[PDB]
Amino acid sequence: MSEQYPVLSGAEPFYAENGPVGVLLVHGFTGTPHSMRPLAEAYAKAGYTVCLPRLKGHGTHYEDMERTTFHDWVASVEEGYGWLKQRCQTIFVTGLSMGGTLTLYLAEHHPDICGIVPINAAVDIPAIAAGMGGELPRYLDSIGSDLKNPDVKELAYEKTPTASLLQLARLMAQTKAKLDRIVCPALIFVSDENHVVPPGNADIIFQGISSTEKEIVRLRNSYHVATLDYDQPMIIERSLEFFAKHA
Ligand SMILES: CCCCCCCCCCCC(=O)OC[C@H](O)CO
């Protein structure tokens, strides 16, 4: 399958060829590279080779998204991973929300990942589970992003295909079940206040992985879309320190 709608302005992937250490940045469910771009540029400015891919069916139209499965999103991250492998001796992976879910997934299936930085990664959202409750419409209306800062507009679909929620749940289930395969260092960000993903998820992740070096930083001035919120500078700074520590 291939997207039927054109890529939208602002949703372009971002690539930067610099040093031998690479960072893969993964955006979230219904989102676009916009949400991860400031992190990618800061890392690029710091001298890192950077890959920020666009997930299949994202940044085009939600009908494209509707036609995808989580295998497609996984494939989009792998292409980015593969792109960095051609260029880098050392690879870190970071991601927001489902990007974090994809970050964990990637660490579960590659042995050569140097470290991961999941940010509000999703592994258990019981509400999504609803068994499947009653019959939901085909598309759920988005009512805006979970952000503390009101003057940020995040680039994301205005509707969510309910068919994709099932895809999300499965990605989460398989990622959660195989957490013990992650052995690389982990820097885990979690928002104290989060209206999307239960913040007890960070703990499931912290406990589930086999990593010998793992930490949690609780963000106290951000909601769910933390990468664009007030704690962005800390996320960027603390991440850079992680990369240098483990290079
Ligand atoms: C009946 C279902 C209600 C709950 C809907 C679940 C939505 C969770 C989406 C996961 C988040 C995502 O991966 O990225 C977050 C995105 O940037 C939000 O703007």
Residue numbers in the entry: 1 to 132, 135 to 249
Paper text:
Monoacylglycerol lipases (MGLs) play an important role in lipid catabolism across all kingdoms of life by catalyzing the release of free fatty acids from monoacylglycerols. Here, we present a comprehensive study of five crystal structures of MGL from Bacillus sp. H257 in its free form and in complex with different substrate analogs and the natural substrate 1-lauroylglycerol. Crystallographic studies of MGLs have resulted in the determination of three-dimensional structures of human MGL (hMGL) and its ortholog from a moderately thermophilic soil bacterium Bacillus sp. H-257 (bMGL) in free form and in complex with inhibitors. Both MGLs possess the expected α/β-hydrolase core domain harboring a catalytic triad.
The bMGL(D196N) variant was crystallized in the presence of 1-LG (C12:0) and 1-OG (C18:1) yielding crystals of space group P212121 with six molecules in the asymmetric unit. Of both crystals, we only interpreted the electron density of the bMGL(D196N)-1-LG crystal in chain A as substrate. The hydroxyl group of Ser-35 and the backbone nitrogen of Gly-28 are also engaged in interactions with the glycerol moiety via this water molecule. The fact that only one water was observed in the bMGL(D196N)·1-LG complex structure might be due to the lower resolution of that dataset.
